[PDB]
Design a binder for these strands. Structure first.
Length: 166
DNA sequence: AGCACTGGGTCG
DNA sequence: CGACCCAGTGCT
């Protein structure tokens, strides 16, 4: 991992991003697969999307990564990031371990730090926190029609803002 | 049980 | 019709 690529993806979370995280067990709201929807341009932040869809007629190009859910102390070696190429151009980051946990809601900030070629750490930056205030401006790029914002920050400065050594 | 799939929505 | 948004179904 080149020094230039040791960065953190900051993205403002929406409703669909946290619908299953906030939902109660057995609710329709808490049904389905839990993702964070990212920008399609962020694929260069991830390993080569080479893993193909087994079933299905439409093409999906996926990659498996080690995601370190920091807020729940869990490293999922099977965190799938998928580009729905022939469907709706969704770029999804699997976050199923946060289901029914309620650690994130709308306008919270997801911080995805790249610490290796295939190694990542996921932190939820709750709204109302100084960290959220200092991280929010780094999300300059507007995506979606619901006002999602994303951007990148050096692991250094992010580490300073949240008080963590990388 | 829970995620790989499905397939609409909406805005420009 | 490109690019996120959203709510599931059904297969493993």
């Amino acid at each position: 991992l080149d020094e230039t690529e040791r960065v953190t993806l900051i993205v403002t979370l929406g409703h669909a991003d946290t619908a299953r995280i906030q939902a109660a067990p057995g609710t329709t709201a808490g049904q389905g697969t839990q993702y964070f929807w990212l920008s399609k341009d962020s694929y260069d932040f991830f390993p080569p999307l080479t893993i193909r869809n087994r079933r299905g007629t439409k093409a999906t190009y996926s990659s498996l990564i080690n995601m370190n859910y920091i807020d729940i102390n869990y490293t999922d070696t099977q965190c799938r990031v998928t580009f729905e190429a022939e469907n709706n151009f969704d770029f999804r980051l699997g976050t199923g371990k946060l289901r029914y946990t309620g650690v994130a809601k709308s306008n919270d900030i997801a911080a995805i730090t790249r610490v290796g070629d295939s190694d990542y750490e996921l932190r939820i930056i709750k709204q109302g926190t100084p960290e959220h205030s200092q991280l929010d401006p780094y999300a300059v790029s507007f995506i979606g029609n619901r006002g999602k914002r994303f951007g990148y920050i050096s692991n250094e400065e992010f580490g300073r803002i949240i008080g963590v050594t990388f």
